[PDB]
């Protein structure tokens, strides 16, 4: 559902970046074009940029949303940005890795960040696994490890056999053999239990 204000904002963001869609330019443009929008219109503008295939602009829209008072981190939404990013594109890969760092930070330095269960113990494992699946499929091995380590290993997020298999095979396939070995240890630990 595209409103008048969302349509205008999408057109402005495209206009502002017609010559330069690099992160600094897209970042400045996104705050200028989208910074007056209410939640519904901002998310509609983001989704329309996604639909048109303007991935970098849609990501810039996401980052505007992430700073809004109403925002709630959704690893499944992040998973969609990962899966829709262009494969084997260094700039997009860098932007995806940065998005994962931003996700980890927004959780760990968020309101729940202080004691004592931790930010990750109550995390939706299904959605978290979707993000990790997406990262591994996109070849973003370090990013996947970062999420797995922060949430599962360190954040004591109790996870399934499926998460272990995704990660163990993913790390190996992508050449992070030390990380693969860590996951295999975790999987073995799981197996000895069930």
Structure tokens given for 30? 């996104």
- Cα angle value 38/44/47 (rounded, 5°): 140
How many residues can be counted in the chain?
194
**From CA 172, how far away is CA 183, in angstroms rounded?**
10
Q: What is the DSSP string of 75-142?
A: HHHHHHHHHTSPTT-HHHHHHHHHHHHHHHHHHHTSGGGSSSS-SSTT--HHHHHHHHHHHHHTT-HH
Structure tokens given for 112? 């729940």
Contacts of 75 (CB under 8 A, 6+ apart): 103, 123, 124, 127, 128, 130, 131
Long-range contact list for 8-14, CB < 8 A, 24+ apart?
A: 9/33, 9/34, 9/36, 9/37, 9/41, 9/42, 9/45, 10/45, 10/48, 10/49, 10/52, 13/45, 13/49, 13/57, 13/60, 13/61, 14/54, 14/57
What SS3 state is found at 130?
Answer: helix
Please report, for the chain, the start and end positions of each structural domain, with discontinuous segments joined by +: 1-194
What SS3 state is found at 175?
Answer: coil
Structure tokens given for 96? 């995806």
CB 163 within 8 A of CB 148: yes
* Neighbour count for residue 182 (Cβ, 10 Å): 18
Angle between helices 75-83 and 55-66 (to 10 degrees): 160
Resolution of this entry in Å? 1.6
- Cα angle value 100/59/73 (rounded, 5°): 50
* The CATH classification of domain 1-194, taken from the options 1.25.40.10, 1.10.340.30, 2.60.40.10, 3.40.50.20: 1.25.40.10
Cis peptide before 116 (omega within 30 of 0): yes
């Amino acid at each position: 559902s595209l409103s008048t204000e969302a349509i205008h904002a999408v057109q402005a963001l495209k206009r502002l970046t017609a010559a330069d869609r690099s992160p600094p330019a897209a970042t400045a443009a996104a705050s200028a074009a989208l910074g007056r929008l209410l939640r519904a219109d901002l998310l509609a503008a983001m989704a329309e940029l996604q639909r048109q295939g303007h991935w970098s602009l849609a990501l810039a829209a996401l980052h505007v949303a992430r700073a809004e008072p109403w925002y709630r981190p959704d690893p499944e939404l992040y998973a969609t940005f990962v899966s829709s990013s262009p494969s084997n594109d260094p700039a997009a890969a860098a932007a995806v890795d940065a998005l994962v760092e931003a996700f980890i930070e927004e959780k760990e330095r968020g309101a729940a960040g202080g004691s004592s269960e931790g930010v990750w113990v109550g995390e939706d494992v299904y959605k978290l696994t979707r993000l990790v699946r997406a990262l591994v499929a996109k070849g973003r091995a370090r990013a996947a490890w970062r999420v797995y380590e922060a949430a599962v290993r360190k954040g004591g997020c109790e996870v399934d056999e499926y998460m272990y298999r995704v990660m163990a095979k993913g790390m190996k396939r992508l050449g992070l053999d030390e990380e693969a070995a860590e996951v295999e240890a975790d999987l073995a630990d799981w197996e000895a239990r069930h």
